[model samples]
Target: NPTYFFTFGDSYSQTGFSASGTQPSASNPMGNPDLGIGTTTNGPNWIGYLTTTENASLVLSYNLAAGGATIDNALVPAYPGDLASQFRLFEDVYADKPASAPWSAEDAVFGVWIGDNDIGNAYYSTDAETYTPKLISRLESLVEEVYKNGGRKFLFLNVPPTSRSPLFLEQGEEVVKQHAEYLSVYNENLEGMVDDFTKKKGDVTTVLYDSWSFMTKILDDPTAYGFPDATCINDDGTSCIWWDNYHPGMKYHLLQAEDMKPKLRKLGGW
Candidate 1:
């Protein structure tokens, strides 16, 4: 059996899929023409690395993640593609193609890794206790929609410890602490939602990647993972963990993808 990978999220998971027709492969992994894809990292993000290298069999990937997408029309409107709009695009546009479309629940896996922009950018304006459930509900709806559309396997990545990122570090200690608290709330709610979703849908397979704790561990001991502890981009040598103020470096992205391969294989059943 083969696997068809579909990714939905923000810049952390995009691989520049253009409907104008660009193909992804081992030689040109991030898709061709130009690698101007909206990845936050320095190289291929998690989905790219997963589809290009970790996929054991034939895999076709479609990335519908924008640079700053929220779950719905919260932080950013639905002009480009929020998570809900992205689901609609898949259902109304891609899946509505001719009968020759080669997707099925048995051979498909949906990757969802959103919510950073929602909580990251909208924290000051929104109340975490009120908005967290709304975010989880939207996430659950996306899963239900996919489940209805014959997607039985899902891989959801929770937000990492962005409070420690350079983007938040420069803002001052108070802002950093606030963002961390917000993320703690968001991640806890997300885990609860995933647990409930799995219990409710007994036939489906779901895996919640604890990216917050994982990245936290990395931040605690970067040298153990072959990365420098500094938040800034490496000047002398390319060994730092962060690429910019907000995104992780290429090495961390690679490590993340590699780390998740086994879990992906187990959940994807491939």
Candidate 2:
């Protein structure tokens, strides 16, 4: 049995997999760009680690992750697109619902790991306090749309701990703490939405992964996770936790899938 993983996110989860490109095969499971190629992490990002190495089942991942996607462009303002843009991509491309992943509800698992950009930018340029309500509500609406489209299994990776990122660390305390506060706020609202979706749609399985806590866990004890320090940013997949100032490196993503392995077992389709 094949498990279809429908991925939606931004730079954090993208692997530059093209829609009309080379398809996934047993040899190259990621479908395009080679595994770890063109990924943000300088190595395989979290989804890559999971779909390729950490996975328990044969997973055909249809990645519709736009590099700078947000909940909705009209509300949040991303460069080229948003989740709405990806949903359209899903409909025409796979929505494999392959030839057309030839997937169905029982075997398909939808994973959404967005909002880092939205919360990050809004905390700076706009007002996150007032905008987060509508912003997260839009996220819920999108999940609801997926449910209506026959998607029953879900994974929600909360906003990351960019507050501790090298980018924010350099900006000093105020910027760091404020963004940290906002991420918590955004994630709290997200938690409530997960609860709401569970109750409103009983025939669903939702797995919430708190990237914040995990990020903190590694950051608090950097060496344990193979980092030199929490703020070390580099292209070294061997040492640094961050691939760049904004994105995390392969080590972080690898462990992300590592920690997620057991969690996903409960929500398995792979």
| Number of the predicted model whose TM-score against the real structure is largest | 2
Residue range 151-237, candidate 2, lDDT tens digits? 899999998788888888999899898888888888988988888888888988889998889889888999986677987778876
Where is the poorest 10-residue window by lDDT in model 2? 95-104
Error of model 2, residue 267, in angstroms: 2.4
State each model's C-alpha RMSD to the native. 2.8, 1.5
Model 2 TM-score relative to the real fold: 0.95
Q: Write the per-residue lDDT of candidate 1 for residues 52-101, one digit (tens) a residue.
A: 66767766676777767888885335446789878887787556432323
Clashing pairs in 1: none
Global Cα lDDT for candidate 1: 0.75
Q: How many angstroms is residue 91 displaced in model 2 relative to the true structure, after the best TM-score fit? A: 1.8
Supply candidate 1's per-residue lDDT for 220: 91
